[PDB]
Each structure stands twice: as structure tokens, then as C-alpha cells.
Amino acid sequence: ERRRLGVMGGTFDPIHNGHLVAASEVADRFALDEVIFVPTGQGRKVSPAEHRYLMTVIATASNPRFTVSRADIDRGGATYTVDTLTDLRTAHPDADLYFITGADALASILSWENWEQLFTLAKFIGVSRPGYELSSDHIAHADGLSLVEVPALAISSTDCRIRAGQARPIWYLVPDGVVQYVAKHRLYS
Amino acid sequence: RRRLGVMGGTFDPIHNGHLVAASEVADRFALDEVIFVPTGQRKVSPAEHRYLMTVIATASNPRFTVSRADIDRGGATYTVDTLTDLRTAHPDADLYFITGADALASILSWENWEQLFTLAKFIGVSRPGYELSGLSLVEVPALAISSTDCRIRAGQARPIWYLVPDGVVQYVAKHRLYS
Numbered sequence: 215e216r217r218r219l220g221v222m223g224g225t226f227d228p229i230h231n232g233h234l235v236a237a238s239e240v241a242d243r244f245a246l247d248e249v250i251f252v253p254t255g256q257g258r259k260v261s262p263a264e265h266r267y268l269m270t271v272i273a274t275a276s277n278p279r280f281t282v283s284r285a286d287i288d289r290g291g292a293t294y295t296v297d298t299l300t301d302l303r304t305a306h307p308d309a310d311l312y313f314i315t316g317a318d319a320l321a322s323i324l325s326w327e328n329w330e331q332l333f334t335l336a337k338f339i340g341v342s343r344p345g346y347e348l349s350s351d352h353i354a355h356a357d358g359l360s361l362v363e364v365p366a367l368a369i370s371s372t373d374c375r376i377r378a379g380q381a382r383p384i385w386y387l388v389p390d391g392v393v394q395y396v397a398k399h400r401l402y403s
Numbered sequence: 404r405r406r407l408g409v410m411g412g413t414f415d416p417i418h419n420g421h422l423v424a425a426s427e428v429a430d431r432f433a434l435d436e437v438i439f440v441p442t443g444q445r446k447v448s449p450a451e452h453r454y455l456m457t458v459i460a461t462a463s464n465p466r467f468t469v470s471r472a473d474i475d476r477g478g479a480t481y482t483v484d485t486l487t488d489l490r491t492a493h494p495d496a497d498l499y500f501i502t503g504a505d506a507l508a509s510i511l512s513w514e515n516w517e518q519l520f521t522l523a524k525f526i527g528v529s530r531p532g533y534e535l536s537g538l539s540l541v542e543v544p545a546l547a548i549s550s551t552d553c554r555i556r557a558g559q560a561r562p563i564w565y566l567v568p569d570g571v572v573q574y575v576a577k578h579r580l581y582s
């Protein structure tokens with residue numbers, strides 16, 4: 215039972231309060247002393263990695279326990295969580311990793327590259343998300359997976375992008391820094 | 404003529420639920436400004452803390468202001484008195500009182516409630532938990548957040564990050580409001 219590092223992977227395009235409240239609640243419920251946010255590397259035109267990274271940095275800046283890693287952005291090619299977990303175990307050799315996933319992402323886990331290997335590298339925490347069933351029953355045939363209720367914020371990055379594309383407000387769905395960053399760099403307009 | 408939103412509340416504390424509701428209303432009704440009105444004085448926090456949290460929370464939004472009209476008036480806060488005060492202080496403006504679903508059903512038992520609809524139009528915003536049942540109804544993003552849960556999280560040293568604005572997180576900790 216070594217020290218606990220949270221890991222939250224995502225496109226973060228943009229990062230929103232949904233992601234951040236999930237990470238925060240998990241950090242508290244599992245006494246994580248840090249959460250590492252990992253934007254993924256590069257139909258829909260995903261915003262450039264540097265913008266996704268910077269928005270995530272700005273969004274997490276104010277929280278004492280939140281940091282951001284360039285591991286996936288700097289690796290190049292397809293982002294796979296096995297590679298993300300490999301990298302972070304190398305960077306934090308004496309820590310136990312806790313990969314944080316929302317209900318919709320958890321439900322997809324069997325399609326992930328070398329998915330069996332995931333549970334040799336980290337423990338997984340599924341968090342609730344409005345409009346999705348939180349469940350471990352899809353991998354019942356496989357304390358490597360814990361399910362957690364977090365505050366229900368019905369926010370998606372898709373909705374945030376659509377609003378911003380329509381000049382409709384994204385205030386309070388995303389941190390004030392992200393509102394500014396999105397307007398200044400004209401990310402979805 | 405100005406189209407003013409009015410969001411009355413205890414705001415103990417103000418949270419993103421309140422703010423996202425006012426933001427969406429401001430957008431859909433093309434309001435020039437939304438005025439947040441903390442009520443005057445179940446141990447509710449002092450008026451000045453509730454006023455200043457609301458000022459800090461609204462500061463960054465270009466279209467949000469805060470009135471101390473109910474604080475300065477003293478005694479029991481009645482929305483008929485709030486709206487008449489704002490009819491005086493902004494005589495050439497249309498008023499829109501924004502209320503959630505939990506408070507919408509209770510309106511029939513507000514002091515002189517029938518007079519409310521001679522001073523302003525009302526906007527009911529959806530809220531998680533409750534059903535949304537002179538008056539318009541608008542869907543807003545569903546943030547299942549309550550002031551009560553926030554106070555409870557604060558008192559148990561659990562995080563209120565991302566449920567309330569960063570400024571309110573700092574203010575609540577600095578002034579030890581629910582500890």
C-alpha cells in the first residue's frame with residue numbers, strides 16, 4: 215500500500231467542471247495527495263494538443279492537488295492508456311496509480327489496447343456521470359475496480375463546443391480561465 | 404428600455420447552479436443585466452458574508468451585478484418589496500424574476516403574491532431533483548448542486564471545488580463560515 219496518485223486521462227477539448235468535480239471527489243474519497251491530468255495526443259477536428267494542454271493547465275492551476283502531464287502529447291502516435299500508465303509508473307516508481315474514468319469511458323474498457331494489462335499497472339475508479347449507467351458487470355468475468363458517486367453535473371465537452379460555436383455562454387460549465395482561453399484563441403468559432 | 408433579470412436568493416453560499424441558471428436565462432431572454440439580490444436576515448449566515456460571496460462570485464461576469472436593497476431595507480425580506488425598490492431605482496426597465504423549480508411551487512404563499520406579477524414577469528428554471536411545474540419556463544444545464552450540500556461538505560472538510568466559484572471556495576475557508 216504505497217502512496218496514491220490519481221490519473222485522469224482525456225481529450226479535454228475543453229476541460230470542464232464535470233471532469234474537475236469528478237477528480238476532486240475521488241481525490242477526497244481515496245485520500246489521493248495528487249491527481250495527474252493527462253491530455254491525449256492528436257471526423258471531428260480535435261483542437262491542437264498545445265491548446266488542450268494549456269486549457270487543462272489553466273483549469274487545474276488553482277487546485278493544490280492537481281497537475282498536468284505532457285506524457286501522451288509528447289509520446290506521439292495513438293494514445294493508449296497502457297502507455298500512459300507505463301510512463302507514469304516510470305516517473306513515479308514508488309506510487310500506486312489510480313486511473314479515473316467516467317461511466318461512459320469505463321463501459322468501453324474492453325475495446326482498449328491490451329486492456330487486460332491495465333489492471334497490472336493501476337487500479338481503476340469509475341465515477342458516475344448523468345445520462346450513463348455506472349456498472350462493473352461488463353468485466354465481472356475478468357480491489358482493481360471501484361465505483362464512486364460524484365456530484366451530478368450534466369456537462370459535456372460536446373455541449374461546451376456547440377455553445378461556444380453558437381456564441382452561447384459556457385460560463386460556470388468550465389472554469390473562468392477556460393472561458394477566457396476559448397474566447398481569446400477562437401477555438402470553436 | 405433595459406431588460407433586467409433579477410435573481411433573489413439566500414446565497415449561503417452562492418454556487419454554480421445559481422450562476423449557470425442566470426447565465427442561461429440572460430442568454431435566452433437577451434437580458435442586458437442580471438441583478439442578484441441576497442435576502443436580509445436554520446442559522447443563516449450573516450447578511451454581509453452572503454452579500455460579499457455573491458459579489459465575489461459574480462465579479463468576473465460582465466452582465467452580473469448584486470443589489471444590497473433587501474439587506475439595507477431590514478426586517479423580513481418580501482419579493483414585492485424587492486421588486487418595488489428596483490422599479491424605483493431602475494424606472495425605465497422590464498424586470499424578470501428568475502426562480503428555480505423548488506421555489507416556483509411555493510410562490511403562492513409569498514406575501515402579496517398576486518402583486519408580484521404586476522411588477523415583473525417570472526422565469527422558472529429547471530433544477531435536478533424537482534419537477535418544473537406572466538410566467539415563462541426555461542431549461543438550463545442540470546447541475547445537481549445545493550447550498551445545503553455545500554455547507555455540509557464545508558463543515559465535514561470535504562471539497563466544494565467546482566460546485567462554487569474559486570473565489571467562494573477561498574472566502575468560505577478564510578472566514579471559516581460553516582466550520
Ligand SMILES: Nc1ncnc2c1ncn2[C@@H]1O[C@H](COP(=O)(O)OP(=O)(O)OC[C@H]2O[C@@H]([n+]3cccc(C(=O)O)c3)[C@H](O)[C@@H]2O)[C@@H](O)[C@H]1O
Pocket residue numbers: 222223224225226227231232233236254293294295296314315316317318319320325326327341342343344367368369370371
Ligand atoms: N460530467 C462528467 N462527470 C463525470 N465524469 C465525466 C464527466 N464528463 C466526462 N467525464 C469523464 O471524464 C473523462 C475525460 O473525458 P473526455 O475528455 O471526453 O476524454 P475521453 O475521450 O472520453 O477519453 C477518456 C480516457 O480514455 C482513454 N482511452 C480511450 C479510448 C481508448 C483507449 C485505449 O487505451 O485504447 C483509452 C483516453 O486516452 C482517455 O485517457 C472520461 O473518463 C469521461 O467519462
Ligand SMILES: Nc1ncnc2c1ncn2[C@@H]1O[C@H](COP(=O)(O)OP(=O)(O)OC[C@H]2O[C@@H]([n+]3cccc(C(=O)O)c3)[C@H](O)[C@@H]2O)[C@@H](O)[C@H]1O
Pocket residue numbers: 410411412413414415420421424440442480481482483501502503504505506507512513514528529530531546547548549550
Ligand atoms: N442548482 C440549481 N439550479 C437552478 N436553480 C437553482 C439551483 N439551486 C437553487 N436554485 C434556485 O436559485 C434561487 C436561489 O436559491 P436560494 O439561495 O436557496 O434562495 P431562497 O432562500 O430559496 O429564496 C429565493 C428567493 O425567494 C424569495 N422568497 C422566498 C420565500 C418567501 C418570499 C416572500 O416574498 O414571501 C420570497 C427570497 O426572498 C429569494 O429572493 C431559487 O429560486 C432556487 O430555486
